[PDB]
Design a protein around this motif. Sequence first.
Motif, PDB file in Angstrom:
ATOM      1  N   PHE A  29       0.765  -1.039   0.072  1.00  0.00           N
ATOM      2  CA  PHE A  29      -0.051  -0.008   0.105  1.00  0.00           C
ATOM      3  C   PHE A  29       1.084   1.327  -0.027  1.00  0.00           C
ATOM      4  O   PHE A  29       0.699   2.128  -0.570  1.00  0.00           O
ATOM      5  CB  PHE A  29      -0.826  -0.038   1.218  1.00  0.00           C
ATOM      6  N   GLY A  30       1.996   1.278   0.785  1.00  0.00           N
ATOM      7  CA  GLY A  30       2.864   2.460   0.891  1.00  0.00           C
ATOM      8  C   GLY A  30       4.089   2.291   1.788  1.00  0.00           C
ATOM      9  O   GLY A  30       4.531   1.164   1.996  1.00  0.00           O
ATOM     10  N   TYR A  31       4.861   3.472   1.834  1.00  0.00           N
ATOM     11  CA  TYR A  31       5.861   3.514   2.277  1.00  0.00           C
ATOM     12  C   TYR A  31       6.065   4.688   3.715  1.00  0.00           C
ATOM     13  O   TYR A  31       5.288   5.452   3.298  1.00  0.00           O
ATOM     14  CB  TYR A  31       7.141   4.036   1.574  1.00  0.00           C
ATOM     15  N   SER A  32       6.604   4.255   4.855  1.00  0.00           N
ATOM     16  CA  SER A  32       6.740   5.310   5.646  1.00  0.00           C
ATOM     17  C   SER A  32       8.191   5.215   6.095  1.00  0.00           C
ATOM     18  O   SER A  32       8.822   4.034   6.548  1.00  0.00           O
ATOM     19  CB  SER A  32       5.721   5.178   6.965  1.00  0.00           C
ATOM     20  N   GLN A  89       9.534   1.451   7.060  1.00  0.00           N
ATOM     21  CA  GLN A  89       8.273   0.533   7.042  1.00  0.00           C
ATOM     22  C   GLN A  89       7.624   0.574   5.858  1.00  0.00           C
ATOM     23  O   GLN A  89       7.243   1.732   5.294  1.00  0.00           O
ATOM     24  CB  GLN A  89       7.486   0.730   8.127  1.00  0.00           C
ATOM     25  N   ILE A  91       4.227  -1.216   4.026  1.00  0.00           N
ATOM     26  CA  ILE A  91       2.833  -1.583   4.429  1.00  0.00           C
ATOM     27  C   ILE A  91       2.509  -2.527   3.395  1.00  0.00           C
ATOM     28  O   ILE A  91       2.252  -2.160   2.301  1.00  0.00           O
ATOM     29  CB  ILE A  91       1.814  -0.397   4.520  1.00  0.00           C
ATOM     30  N   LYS A  92       2.140  -3.957   3.752  1.00  0.00           N
ATOM     31  CA  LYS A  92       1.798  -4.984   2.798  1.00  0.00           C
ATOM     32  C   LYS A  92       0.046  -5.005   2.918  1.00  0.00           C
ATOM     33  O   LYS A  92      -0.562  -4.445   3.616  1.00  0.00           O
ATOM     34  CB  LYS A  92       2.145  -6.255   3.284  1.00  0.00           C
ATOM     35  N   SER A  93      -0.258  -5.501   1.876  1.00  0.00           N
ATOM     36  CA  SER A  93      -1.648  -5.585   1.844  1.00  0.00           C
ATOM     37  C   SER A  93      -2.572  -6.288   2.791  1.00  0.00           C
ATOM     38  O   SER A  93      -3.581  -6.139   3.002  1.00  0.00           O
ATOM     39  CB  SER A  93      -1.996  -6.170   0.160  1.00  0.00           C
ATOM     40  N   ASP A  94      -1.677  -7.276   3.370  1.00  0.00           N
ATOM     41  CA  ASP A  94      -2.486  -7.973   4.479  1.00  0.00           C
ATOM     42  C   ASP A  94      -2.115  -7.412   5.823  1.00  0.00           C
ATOM     43  O   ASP A  94      -2.742  -8.034   6.828  1.00  0.00           O
ATOM     44  CB  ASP A  94      -1.762  -9.273   4.508  1.00  0.00           C
ATOM     45  N   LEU A  95      -1.444  -6.199   5.768  1.00  0.00           N
ATOM     46  CA  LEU A  95      -1.327  -5.269   7.237  1.00  0.00           C
ATOM     47  C   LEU A  95      -0.180  -6.082   8.055  1.00  0.00           C
ATOM     48  O   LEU A  95       0.048  -5.568   9.344  1.00  0.00           O
ATOM     49  CB  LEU A  95      -2.323  -4.884   7.801  1.00  0.00           C
ATOM     50  N   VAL A  96       0.322  -7.229   7.484  1.00  0.00           N
ATOM     51  CA  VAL A  96       1.604  -7.968   8.129  1.00  0.00           C
ATOM     52  C   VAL A  96       2.845  -7.178   7.457  1.00  0.00           C
ATOM     53  O   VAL A  96       3.651  -7.547   6.507  1.00  0.00           O
ATOM     54  CB  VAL A  96       1.709  -9.410   8.149  1.00  0.00           C
ATOM     55  N   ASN A  97       3.432  -6.053   8.216  1.00  0.00           N
ATOM     56  CA  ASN A  97       4.313  -5.220   7.377  1.00  0.00           C
ATOM     57  C   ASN A  97       5.668  -5.521   7.934  1.00  0.00           C
ATOM     58  O   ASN A  97       5.969  -6.113   8.746  1.00  0.00           O
ATOM     59  CB  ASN A  97       3.732  -3.863   8.297  1.00  0.00           C
ATOM     60  N   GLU A  99       9.707  -3.681   8.266  1.00  0.00           N
ATOM     61  CA  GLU A  99      10.652  -2.681   8.648  1.00  0.00           C
ATOM     62  C   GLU A  99      11.956  -2.879   8.001  1.00  0.00           C
ATOM     63  O   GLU A  99      12.676  -3.977   8.249  1.00  0.00           O
ATOM     64  CB  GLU A  99      10.730  -2.507  10.078  1.00  0.00           C
TER      65      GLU A  99
ATOM     66  N   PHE B  29      -6.276   2.399   5.788  1.00  0.00           N
ATOM     67  CA  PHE B  29      -6.343   1.107   5.211  1.00  0.00           C
ATOM     68  C   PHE B  29      -6.165  -0.162   5.787  1.00  0.00           C
ATOM     69  O   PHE B  29      -6.946  -0.873   5.717  1.00  0.00           O
ATOM     70  CB  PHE B  29      -4.706   1.030   4.296  1.00  0.00           C
ATOM     71  N   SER B  32      -2.510  -2.880  12.737  1.00  0.00           N
ATOM     72  CA  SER B  32      -1.740  -3.740  12.774  1.00  0.00           C
ATOM     73  C   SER B  32      -1.380  -3.738  14.732  1.00  0.00           C
ATOM     74  O   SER B  32      -1.178  -2.663  15.204  1.00  0.00           O
ATOM     75  CB  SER B  32      -0.265  -3.639  12.005  1.00  0.00           C
ATOM     76  N   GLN B  44       4.474  -8.897  15.872  1.00  0.00           N
ATOM     77  CA  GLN B  44       3.199  -8.559  15.193  1.00  0.00           C
ATOM     78  C   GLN B  44       2.333  -9.824  15.805  1.00  0.00           C
ATOM     79  O   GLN B  44       2.572 -11.021  15.376  1.00  0.00           O
ATOM     80  CB  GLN B  44       3.314  -8.633  14.018  1.00  0.00           C
ATOM     81  N   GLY B  47      -2.479  -8.627  11.698  1.00  0.00           N
ATOM     82  CA  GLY B  47      -2.587  -7.607  10.666  1.00  0.00           C
ATOM     83  C   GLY B  47      -4.161  -7.573  10.130  1.00  0.00           C
ATOM     84  O   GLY B  47      -4.615  -8.869   9.964  1.00  0.00           O
ATOM     85  N   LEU B  95      -0.076   7.296   4.401  1.00  0.00           N
ATOM     86  CA  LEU B  95       0.909   6.588   4.989  1.00  0.00           C
ATOM     87  C   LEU B  95       1.579   7.357   6.319  1.00  0.00           C
ATOM     88  O   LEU B  95       2.833   6.966   6.504  1.00  0.00           O
ATOM     89  CB  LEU B  95       1.882   6.272   4.023  1.00  0.00           C
TER      90      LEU B  95
END
Lengths: 107, 107
Positions: A29-32, A89, A91-97, A99, B29, B32, B44, B47, B95
Motif C-alpha cells: 500500500f505504501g511506505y513510511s 516501514q 505496508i503490505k496488503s495483508d497489514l503484516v508489515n 521494517e 487502510f 496492525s 506482530q 494484521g 501513510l
Amino acid sequence: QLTTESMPFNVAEGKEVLLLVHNLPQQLFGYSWYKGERVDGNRQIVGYAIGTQQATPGPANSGRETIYPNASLLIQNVTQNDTGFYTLQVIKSDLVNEEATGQFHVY
Amino acid sequence: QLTTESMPFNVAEGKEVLLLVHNLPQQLFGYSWYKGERVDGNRQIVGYAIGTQQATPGPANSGRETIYPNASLLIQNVTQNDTGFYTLQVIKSDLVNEEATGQFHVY
C-alpha cells in the motif's frame, strides 16, 4: 529480507546520501520512513501512498529529503544531525508489515 | 489522539481482556497490533485489512486473540506472559500513520 544501504556510508557535510532499498516486497500500500531505529509517528520523515503517488511530510521532515517510488530516500545537504539510523516501514496488503533499518555518518 | 484502554486493567489468569480503541481515525487502510511497546514485525500479533476484512496472524499470535473491525483486540484465556504493553498501529491513507499503546496486568 527488505534491506537498505546508504550510498555513501560516510557522507561529507553538505553532500548527499541515498538510502537505497533492496528486496522491496510486492503487493504494497505504501511506505513510511522514520528517523531513528524505530517506527514512531513522532519521528516520521515522510509517508508515501503508491496508488496516488502522494508524499506527505511528517514531524521529522527537514525539507532536504526526496522519497522515490521504489522507496529509496535521497537526503541532500547533509548536516551533523542527520547522522544515525533511519527506518523504513513497508505496508503490505495483508497489514503484516515489514521494517528495515539503515544508517549513515556525516563527517 | 488514538487511544486504547484495557477492560479490565487487572485481569485474572484464565479470564479475558478487551483492548478497546478510542478516536480511531477515518480514511484507514488497516490495523496492525503488536506485543510490546513498539511497532516491530517480529512481534506482530495480527494484521487486518479493512477493505477485504482479512485478519492474518503474525509471529506473536497466540491463537487466543480476536481483532474486530473497529480495531479493538480481545484476548481470551489470559496467561502470565500476556502481561504488559501492546501496540496498535493504524495505517492512514496518506501513510502518515498513528500508534497507541495499551497495557494490562494478569494476576
